[PDB]
Amino acid sequence: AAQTNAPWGLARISSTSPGTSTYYYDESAGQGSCVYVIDTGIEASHPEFEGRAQMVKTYYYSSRDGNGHGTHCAGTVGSRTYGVAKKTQLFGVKVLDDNGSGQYSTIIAGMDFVASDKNNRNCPKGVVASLSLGGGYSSSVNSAAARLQSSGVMVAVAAGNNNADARNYSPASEPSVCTVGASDRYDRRSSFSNYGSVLDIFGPGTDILSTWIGGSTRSISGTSMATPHVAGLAAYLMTLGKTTAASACRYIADTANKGDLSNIPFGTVNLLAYNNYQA
Ligand SMILES: [Ca+2]
C-alpha cells in the first residue's frame, strides 16, 4: 500500500533515504494487534480513529484527553492518515492529567493495569504499549516497565527531551524495554533528544503532524512523537508475524537503517526505525 503526501515521519519509516513523501506498508496494517497509549488519554471520537480507539482506564475525574498529547501520540500509532499501523486497536490509559502531569504511583498502576487488562482484550497478533512520558530515575518506575514487558507486551518508551544521557530518566533507563530517541527530517538527532547506551532505536520526532483534541491536527516535536512511531511499527511487524512482543525491539534494531543519522554521540546507537517493506 502507498499513502501519498504522508507526514514525513511515516515516509521516513518506510524509506532507505530521507526526503521522500510517500508511506509504503503492507495492507495488513496492524490488524489484530493492540496498542495501549499510556498518556493524557485519547479523543476516541476523532474521525481519524474510525472507531478503533477507546478509553479503557483513567485515574482522574474524566477519561477525556483535555490536553491533546495522548491524542497526538495515539494518532501516530494508529490514525488513518497520521498513523504507522492504520488498522490496529488503540486503548487509552489516562495516567497523566490534563496538564500532562502524573505521579509515579499512578504511572506504575497504569502499567500494571495494562499487563492485566490485555487479558480482557482481543489481540491475537500481539500487544504493544507506548509510553511518551518520563521523569527522573526511579527503580520502581523501571521495575513496572520491566514487568509490563515481561508480561508479553512490547513496551516502547520515550528517551526524554533533555539533550542528556537517558540513564538518568525513567522509564527510559529500564534496559529491558525499547527506549526511543528522536530524529528530524534531515536525519539529524533531534536537538532535544536524549542519548546514551540505553537507547535502542531512533524514530521521527521533530515536526510530527498528527491528531489533536477538538477533532483537529497539529505538528509538535519530542521523543514523545518518536515513541509511537516505534510502537506502531512493532504492532505492524507483529501482525505480519515477523516478530513477537518479547523480540520486537531487537528485531527493529536488527532491521533499522544503520549509520544514517548525524550528531549521534559516540556510544549511542545509530539506528533509525525502518519497516523494510518491499512491494
Ligand atoms: Ca532496551
Q: How far is the CA of 61 from the centre of ligand 1 (A)?
A: 34
Q: How far is the CA of 167 from the centre of ligand 1 (A)?
A: 11
Question: Which grid cell sits at 25?
Answer: 506498508
Q: What is the spatial distance between Cα 47 and Cα 25, in angstroms, rounded to a whole number?
A: 22
Resolution (A): 1.5
Q: Which residues contact 24 (CB under 8 A, 6 or more apart)?
A: 1, 2, 3, 14, 15, 275, 277, 279
Q: Of all helices (H) and strands (E), which one includes residue 228?
A: helix 223-239
Task: Give catalytic residue positions.
Answer: 39, 69, 224
Q: What is the spatial distance between Cα 244 and Cα 124, in angstroms, rounded to a whole number?
A: 11
Out of 3.40.50.200, 3.40.190.10, 1.20.140.10, 3.30.70.3170, select the CATH number for domain 1-279. 3.40.50.200
Q: How far is the CA of 199 from the centre of ligand 1 (A)?
A: 6
Q: How far is the CA of 246 from the centre of ligand 1 (A)?
A: 11
Residues 134, 160: contact at Cβ < 8 Å? yes
CA distance readout (Å), 158 to 29, 38, 224: 23, 12, 6
207 annotated to bind ligand:
no
Q: How far is the CA of 60 from the centre of ligand 1 (A)?
A: 31
CA distance readout (Å), 194 to 163, 264, 274: 5, 10, 20
CA distance readout (Å), 94 to 37, 52, 138, 192: 8, 17, 20, 25
Q: Of all helices (H) and strands (E), which one includes residue 217?
A: strand 216-220
16 annotated to bind ligand:
yes
- Across the beta sheet with 33-39, the strand order is 53-58, 89-94, 33-39, 126-131, 153-158, 178-183, 201-204, 271-272, 257-258
β-pair partners for 271: 258
175 annotated to bind ligand:
yes
